[PDB]
């Protein structure tokens, strides 16, 4: 297995990154389409990197999709289904606050999740900046699973939050709150081993740059989850 990481930027900023784990017979493939990825770029890197120990874990959650009227009742409709999680509804409530007024403090998103104290409402990361991103997942045979779950009528990026989302309940994230910080993107979910992964739509107005992650997790836990998010590497079989 080889581990493809790209990131690139445009005038200082990043404008698209992917990263898939595949074996040597599919480097090339994998590499073509990141090299591709971005439309316009000033700077990309991709790093190459082989697998030292690796986990495949077979994914298992329950998609379900909601639709609602405004951001409102589908920002407390996402509140609702964190609390069937066991977050108190004011922690809950306190994750979408913060996304939507902007994650990082010092202004706009951050590339990476809020960790966010179940208990407390409290960040336990100690980058608001740039936040804790979670990286080496991907699908064990993406080819099979895009066309699958696009056939079903889910979108690429939804491709990418399942894996993404599902890495993050295996190392020991409770539940998750995301959303697109994509101005015309607004389905976003929620997502628990209990309530499963949770599409909501309108979870923001159509032009609204700001989105982004909320991790939910024990503190009493919080080294081993971060240890996990940015350092196992876990393929994910349908």
Same mark, same amino acid.
């Given at each position: 297995l080889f581990?493809?990481?790209? *990131?690139?930027?445009?005038?200082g900023k990043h404008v698209s990154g992917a990263e898939?784990?595949?074996? +040597?017979?599919?480097?090339?493939?994998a590499v073509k389409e990141l090299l591709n990825r971005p439309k316009e770029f000033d700077f990309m @890197?991709?790093?190459?990197?082989?697998?030292?120990?690796?986990?495949?874990?077979?994914? @298992?959650? +329950?998609?379900? &999709?909601? =639709?609602?009227?405004s951001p409102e009742e589908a920002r407390e409709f996402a509140v609702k289904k964190l609390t069937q999680e066991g977050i108190k509804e004011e922690v809950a409530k306190k994750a979408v606050e913060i996304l939507s007024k902007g994650a990082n403090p010092k202004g706009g998103n951050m590339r990476g999740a809020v960790l966010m104290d179940i208990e407390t409402g409290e960040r336990l990361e100690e980058d608001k900046?740039?936040?804790?991103? &979670?990286?080496?997942?991907?699908?064990?045979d993406r080819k099979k699973v &895009? %066309?699958?779950?696009?056939?079903?009528?889910? &979108?690429?990026?939804?491709?990418?939050?399942?894996?993404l989302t599902?890495?993050?309940?295996? $190392?020991?994230?409770?539940?998750?709150? $995301?959303?697109?910080?994509?101005?015309?993107?607004?389905t976003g979910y929620v997502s628990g081993k209990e309530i499963g992964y949770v599409r909501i739509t309108p979870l923001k107005e159509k032009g609204d740059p700001?989105?982004?992650?909320?991790?939910?997790? =024990? *503190?009493?836990?919080?080294? %081993?989850?971060? %240890?996990?998010?940015?350092? +196992?590497?876990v393929l994910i079989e349908l």
């Open positions: 581990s493809v990481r790209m *990131r690139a930027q445009k005038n898939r784990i595949v074996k +040597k017979e599919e480097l090339e493939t @890197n991709v790093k190459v990197e082989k697998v030292k120990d690796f986990e495949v874990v077979k994914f @298992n959650l +329950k998609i379900s &999709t909601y =639709s609602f009227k900046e740039r936040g804790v991103r &979670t990286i080496h997942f991907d699908w064990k &895009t %066309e699958k779950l696009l056939k079903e009528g889910y &979108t690429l990026r939804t491709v990418d939050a399942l894996a599902f890495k993050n309940l295996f $190392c020991g994230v409770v539940a998750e709150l $995301c959303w697109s910080d994509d101005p015309d993107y607004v700001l989105g982004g992650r909320v991790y939910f997790v =024990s *503190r009493k836990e919080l080294s %081993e989850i971060i %240890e996990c998010l940015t350092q +196992k590497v």
